[PDB]
Design a protein around this nucleic acid. Structure first.
Lengths: 150, 51, 218
RNA sequence: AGGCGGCCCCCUGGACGAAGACUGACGCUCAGGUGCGAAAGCGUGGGGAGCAAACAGGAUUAGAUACCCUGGUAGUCCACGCCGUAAACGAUGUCGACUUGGAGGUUGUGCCCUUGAGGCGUGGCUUCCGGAGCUAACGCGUUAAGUCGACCGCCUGGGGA
RNA sequence: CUGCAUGGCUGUCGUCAGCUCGUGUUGUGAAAUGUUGGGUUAAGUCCCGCAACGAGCGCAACCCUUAUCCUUUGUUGCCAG
RNA sequence: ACUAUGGUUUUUAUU
């Protein structure tokens, strides 16, 4: 019901007088491992507080999507602003695979096997959103409720 | 000459309404209701038009 | 509520072009809502409100629209509920982690009147100490004991209360609203035909909604 | 389209509106090709009030080959052609079409003897906000940068260019 | 020798009233917000009020002192009874 | 606004 994962904590490069400002920025993802996921960013003067703020920004930003027991239901395409993704299910003996945002956002969505690549813009706060569209494009196996019954 | 009032003057001083003592600029902000003025003094008007 | 799934119509001019799927025309010069939707739209709302109140699910009544600012308690204490009628200062339900301190500031503003000089003097600090104390004591008096979040929200006007309906959409809470042919049905989860201006409408119509929560409390 | 208003008469390609018909896929777009110049430029004359590149000087200044002033050729105008290019701008290719509202300009048209000191409907074009939707932002939004189908052209770093 | 290495000491705009933080809102984001608005003061001084609500630092206040009062003491002073 | 009118201060170790 609440599963959380970190992508990166980094130091900001903004110069103020005698050096680069003493702050830390964190990028995170949060979900329920079965049909909801969201992304968040946060800043602080210490590493734990940057994560504490980012994880809450992710928990307040969740989107509803469909999975098939931690496996992809079909090969699926995702798009966002100046970026694209493609994802497909794996075969036996493979499944991990992937890095950056894809190693995080899919693990809080319950996914245990994937084959995937990201295209266009390289910024992880853009790649994660093409990956969320690349989940929201996937068709549900759920029996809700008359169209395909049952 | 494009004047508002003229001919029988010849005056040592000229004055005419709503053209001196500045009355602004940008005074109708946060919010300046002027108690009752826009209710009459902006009926016609209609030359902005609108746009 | 009050007069069953029947229609009467309200107002003779200016209605919302988004209400086309619910308007049925004019009858006795007023515009009227389709009877064939009036009947079920009442029933599905009262049947869920009965169930929420049966889970002991806390109902919050909003009365920031002047006609309901007293009826939000005086017509609603007929059941177990909570009430608000002042401005929310933002985040009143979405920022509880920081807004819960307002009840402790209401506690601290009373402790500032514990001075030995406050008893013996008559006007010196007697009004200075009350500028926030007697406004927090009024605005929180129907919600301070709750200690958490409501599970349903009830509004008299979905355009006047919209700054609170925004917070309900951030928490996924179902909002129950009164609607007319000039209302807009977006951001609200249950909608019932009515008004707040004939005359003297909410004085008994809101009592018939508190009656639903009273049946949820058996 | 570029653009086109001092006025009157003659000629002349189309435009928009209300209501129908008969023909009967004849259509929509287009490499090359065909037709159209804003202003400046050219050829041959006419015309020459001013204005006016360049020119000769004043004055300002350290300077004045700028601004201001004194004088001024080509050009501007008319007739017939050459030149073919532009921030040629809604920077929205050409065509067909869908989908809420609001405050305005301009102009056809249906009906009522306007109760009376009126208007309500209904086409075309345009202005500024703006919904559903979009975009990096600013903007667009029934005159779409939105969603759909058809055709033709162009672009792949800057400095050199 | 070195205050472009460090603690301490210390200057001035100025004794000017200003500088910011935690959380919500907005923006993709650096950030914007609150501190802006409306009365008033020497003064973000004191109040009113908003998608902002709350908060520290400085400001003002203590103390030094002047116009008086309560009180005690007196030569080497002052010198009336 | 009638104040008619206008140019420099080295690239290079630093705020």
């Amino acid at each position: 019901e609440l599963q959380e994962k970190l992508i990166a904590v980094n130091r900001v490069s903004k110069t103020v007088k005698g050096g680069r400002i003493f702050s830390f920025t964190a990028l995170t993802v949060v979900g329920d491992g079965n049909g909801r996921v969201g992304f968040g960013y946060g800043k602080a003067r210490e590493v734990p507080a940057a994560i504490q703020k980012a994880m809450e920004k992710a928990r307040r930003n969740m989107i509803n999507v469909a999975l098939n027991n931690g496996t992809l239901q079909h090969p699926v395409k995702g798009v966002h602003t100046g970026s694209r993704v493609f994802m497909q299910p794996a075969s036996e003996g493979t499944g991990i695979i992937a890095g950056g945002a894809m190693r995080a956002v899919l693990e809080v969505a319950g996914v245990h096997n994937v084959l995937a690549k990201a295209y266009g813009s390289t910024n992880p706060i853009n790649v994660v959103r093409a990956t969320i569209d690349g989940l929201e494009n996937m068709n549900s196996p759920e029996m809700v409720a008359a169209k395909r019954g049952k | 000459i494009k004047v508002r009032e003229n001919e029988p003057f010849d005056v040592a001083l000229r004055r005419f309404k709503r053209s001196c003592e500045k009355a602004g600029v940008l005074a109708e902000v946060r919010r300046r209701e002027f108690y009752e003025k826009p209710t009459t003094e902006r009926k016609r008007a209609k030359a902005s038009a609108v746009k | 509520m009050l007069k069953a799934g029947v229609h009467f119509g309200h107002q003779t001019r200016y209605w919302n072009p988004k209400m086309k799927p619910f308007i049925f025309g004019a009858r006795n010069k007023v515009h009227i809502i389709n009877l064939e939707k009036t009947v079920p739209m009442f029933n599905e709302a009262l049947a869920e409100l009965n169930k929420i109140a049966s889970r002991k699910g806390k109902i919050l009544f909003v009365g920031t629209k002047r006609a309901a600012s007293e009826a939000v308690k005086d017509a609603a204490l007929s059941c177990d509920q909570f009430f608000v009628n002042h401005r929310w200062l933002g985040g009143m339900l979405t920022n509880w982690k920081t807004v819960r301190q307002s009840i402790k500031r209401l506690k601290d503003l009373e402790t500032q009147s514990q001075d030995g000089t406050f008893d013996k003097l008559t006007k010196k600090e007697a009004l200075m100490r009350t500028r926030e104390l007697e406004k927090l004591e009024n605005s929180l008096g129907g919600i301070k004991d709750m200690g958490g979040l409501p599970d349903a929200l009830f509004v008299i006007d979905a355009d006047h209360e919209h700054i609170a309906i925004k917070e309900a959409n951030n928490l996924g809470i179902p909002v129950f609203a009164i609607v007319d042919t000039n209302s807009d049905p977006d951001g609200v989860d249950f909608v019932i035909p009515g008004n707040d201006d004939a005359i003297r409408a909410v004085t008994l119509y809101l009592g018939a909604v508190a009656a639903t929560v009273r049946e949820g409390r058996s």
